Amino acid sequence: PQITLWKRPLVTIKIGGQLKEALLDTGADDTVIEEMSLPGRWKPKMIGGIGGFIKVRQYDQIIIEIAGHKAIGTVLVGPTPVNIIGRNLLTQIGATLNF
């Protein structure tokens, strides 16, 4: 699709068999999701947002569908105000910015 930006670019994602809403976020290097259960081991990560640095849990090689497109990659879990799909997964679905 071609997504205009008059409204937030919200999509449905599927992760762990569950549907969630998330924002397509070119300003995010990484994908950050609200608290949820994921399989496997996690690693620590500090990320810096507009209001400072939070701790998240980094899970690698997670199956995730984004607007019907299949991806497999890193998901950060923690106290984000919105689920954000960052560049690590936007690249996997072939997303570009155009003007």
Interface with Na ion (CB under 5 A), residue from 3, 12, 26, 60 = 60
Cα–Cα nearest to 66, from 9, 25, 18, 11 = 11
Beta 32-33 vs 18-24: how paired, if at all? Answer: unpaired
Cα–Cα nearest to 62, from 17, 6, 95 = 17
Interface with Na ion (CB under 5 A), residue from 12, 26, 61, 91 = 61
- Site residues (CB under 6 A) for ligand T1R? 23, 25, 27-30, 32, 47-50, 81-82, 84, 86
List all residues 6 or more positions away from 39 whose beta carbon is below 8 Å from its beta carbon: 59
Total number of residues that touch Na ion (CB under 5 A): 3
How far is it, in rounded angstroms, from Cα 81 to Cα 83?
7
Q: Is 92 in the site for Cl ion (CB under 5 A)?
A: no
Q: Is 29 a catalytic residue?
A: no
Q: Is 37 in the site for a second copy (CB under 8 A)?
A: no
**Which residues are known to be catalytic?**
25
> What residue ranges bind a second copy (CB under 8 A)?
1-6, 8-9, 23-29, 32, 47-54, 67, 69, 80-82, 84, 87, 90-91, 93-99
